[PDB]
Amino acid sequence: WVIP
Amino acid sequence: WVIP
Amino acid sequence: SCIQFTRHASDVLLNLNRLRSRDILTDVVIVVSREQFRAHKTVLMACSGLFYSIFTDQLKCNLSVINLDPEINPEGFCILLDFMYTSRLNLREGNIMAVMATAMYLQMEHVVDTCRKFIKAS
Amino acid sequence: SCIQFTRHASDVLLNLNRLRSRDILTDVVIVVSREQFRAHKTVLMACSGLFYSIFTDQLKCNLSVINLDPEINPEGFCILLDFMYTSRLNLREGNIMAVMATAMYLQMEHVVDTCRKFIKAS
Numbered sequence: 381w382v383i384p
Numbered sequence: 385w386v387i388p
Numbered sequence: 389s390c391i392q393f394t395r396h397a398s399d400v401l402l403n404l405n406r407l408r409s410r411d412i413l414t415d416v417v418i419v420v421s422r423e424q425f426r427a428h429k430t431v432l433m434a435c436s437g438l439f440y441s442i443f444t445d446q447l448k449c450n451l452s453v454i455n456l457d458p459e460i461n462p463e464g465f466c467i468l469l470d471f472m473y474t475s476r477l478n479l480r481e482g483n484i485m486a487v488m489a490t491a492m493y494l495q496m497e498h499v500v501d502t503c504r505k506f507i508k509a510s
Numbered sequence: 511s512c513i514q515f516t517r518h519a520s521d522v523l524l525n526l527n528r529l530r531s532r533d534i535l536t537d538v539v540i541v542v543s544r545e546q547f548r549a550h551k552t553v554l555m556a557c558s559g560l561f562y563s564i565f566t567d568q569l570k571c572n573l574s575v576i577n578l579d580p581e582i583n584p585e586g587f588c589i590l591l592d593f594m595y596t597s598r599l600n601l602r603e604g605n606i607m608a609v610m611a612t613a614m615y616l617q618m619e620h621v622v623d624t625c626r627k628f629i630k631a632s
């Protein structure tokens with residue numbers, strides 16, 4: 381999971 | 385396009 | 389000896405979401421309490437262990453309406469349906485409990501994992 | 511303020527390809543000369559400008575069989591259908607001309623672009  |  | 393187009397899967401998902409927003413080729417209504425959600429059975433199956441089981445069933449595969457368990461929160465479902473079609477999860481303090489419970493019911497293991505991690509941190 | 515799961519789109523496409531290989535929820539047959547190819551209309555639309563136009567047509571959207579132009583090569587179509595479901599293109603010296611022509615007809619602009627680049631190099 382990432383910060384888009 | 386890449387070499388997978 | 390194939391070549392690969394890096395953005396292909398993302399572009400496919402983006403177009404499937406555009407079809408969903410325009411209600412094109414949607415073949416099922418998911419009923420969550422009073423709320424109705426139109427979707428594509430194949431996308432639901434690709435994202436959820438529960439929908440995979442439902443639509444591979446020789447009788448349920450032909451249903452145009454699926455009613456979820458009355459404990460399922462319509463907002464939690466909406467957040468998860470958006471994630472299915474975009475890869476983006478709107479996880480907030482006020483919805484994390486409903487999102488995790490809905491993801492456990494829908495059998496969306498990666499969402500369950502991040503919810504457990506975010507709850508543990510707080 | 512969403513979070514994003516990097517592998518989600520690829521995982522969705524992988525599961526849609528698994529449904530295709532097992533002939534699950536396929537809703538159309540594409541006929542190319544004597545050859546038949548089963549697929550999901552939504553995936554074809556998401557990948558091809560031609561299928562997007564066909565299945566948004568109020569009459570054609572309801573057809574279970576689509577016949578392609580007799581000039582279309584079944585092998586070129588097969589390579590392109592595999593690319594639609596995997597992001598992987600089996601581009602070879604012996605098939606590049608048939609793949610480019612089929613991609614131009616199907617309106618798959620990124621495939622047309624790499625075929626033109628590969629032809630130019632040789």
Ligand SMILES: O=C1Cc2cc(Nc3cc(Cl)ncc3Cl)ccc2N1
Binds near residue numbers: 495496498526
């Ligand atoms: O967390 C999850 C997400 C998920 C998706 C699917 N859907 C498929 C799985 C296979 Cl092997 N082939 C085809 C499909 Cl559509 C099943 C279980 C789960 N669990």
Ligand SMILES: O=C1Cc2cc(Nc3cc(Cl)ncc3Cl)ccc2N1
Binds near residue numbers: 558
């Ligand atoms: O090279 C290409 C690939 C492609 C795909 C689609 N399919 C869509 C486009 C839009 Cl805007 N919304 C929804 C869909 Cl399914 C149309 C044209 C082309 N050209």
Ligand SMILES: [Cl-]
Binds near residue numbers: 499
């Ligand atoms: Cl997931």
Ligand SMILES: [Cl-]
Binds near residue numbers: 618
């Ligand atoms: Cl393309």
